[PDB]
Design a protein around this ligand. Sequence first.
Ligand code: NA
Length: 401
Amino acid sequence: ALPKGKPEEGGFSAERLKRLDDHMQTMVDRGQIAGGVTVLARHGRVVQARAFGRRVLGGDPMPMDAIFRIRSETKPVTGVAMMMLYEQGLWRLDDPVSLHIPEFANLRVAKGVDETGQPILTPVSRSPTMRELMTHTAGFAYGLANDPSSPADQAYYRAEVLQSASLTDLVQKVSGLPMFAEPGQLWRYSVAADIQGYIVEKLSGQSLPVFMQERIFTPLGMKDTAFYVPEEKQARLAALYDGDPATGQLVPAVEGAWRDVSKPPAAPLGGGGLVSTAGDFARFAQMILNKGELDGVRILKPETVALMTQNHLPEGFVVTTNGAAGMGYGIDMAVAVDPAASGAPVGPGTVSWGGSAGTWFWIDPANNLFFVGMIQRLGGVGPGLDAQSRTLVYQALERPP
Ligand code: NA
């Protein structure tokens, strides 16, 4: 459900694009993934859309409408939700987060540890700003790591921040737990977008899943995008795999039932809870290339999209993951400020992210194109495929000088 085209209509070599098909098929043959789905589009037309391998090992083939846990790739969708409330005048980037979340008046920061292993806690210099929350520079800790080296992360893990009974609970816990750092000091991947999801609930007066269905998924035609997979769509859900240590062979992932996508979550996570299809995500990506509109439906003003896809980071900062030199960070996505500085082939201003289950995307406004990759494989395989898909896509692209 985007117009199909020949590769040459998007400016691609058919022969060199086939090297991307071959590479995906090699990853299935060598048992690195069960299967996956890829969409490449330029000038609003699909140039390549391909399903590979199987939905489940020794099972049916991967359908193109397969449903995937996008994890941290949910993040930029929450960012679009926040920017809709921005256009309605409900929050400003210079606003203290404490105006929206009053309990954040009680924030404390972890300084050192004392002799008894407990963090030394100090009232925060000031409330983090909304721009810091949108850019992972607000000083919040991470929620999936038992790191004795990072006391703030260990406390979040121990308090079970990400498995709270509600977003109200999650945000009350964060208010009482130690921050990793004072706001504005460094970029560090955090629970910031899960806190953003609470602000959507509080400002919209609707639950996060309802607001996103009404303002994003319904208007853009994203039919299978949600915080769970209803019983009828379960047969299209791709299975999640990990590598057996010492065999390097595909094994069902064991991750705990809090992440289960069979039921509506109690605390829907704006940083990691969405499931989607390559086609639904392709529609979202085309809406960003079109600066806020798809098929006559406008969800954001063009200036608002332009503001999201710029680097909002101070001069100095280091984006340390994409799920490097010349990398910055906009509103809930990475921004390639100067890709040449790392010999990256994407155009300057390219936005991207990826999830822990292996999913990745990039949108390149300078080259009017996007790539959506969907697998369900934990570990380093996803990030390797991202880098290799970027190399093979730009080697197939033929531009004027
Ligand atoms: Na799909």
